[PDB]
Short mmCIF file of C-alpha atoms in Angstrom, two decimals:
data_model
loop_
_atom_site.label_atom_id
_atom_site.label_comp_id
_atom_site.label_asym_id
_atom_site.label_seq_id
_atom_site.Cartn_x
_atom_site.Cartn_y
_atom_site.Cartn_z
CA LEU A 1 -7.78 -0.42 4.39
CA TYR A 2 -4.86 -0.63 2.00
CA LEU A 3 -1.20 0.27 2.42
CA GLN A 4 1.40 0.05 -0.38
CA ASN A 5 5.02 0.95 0.20
CA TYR A 6 7.48 1.19 -2.68
#
């Protein structure tokens, strides 16, 4: 589980 917000 991986979340990246940019």
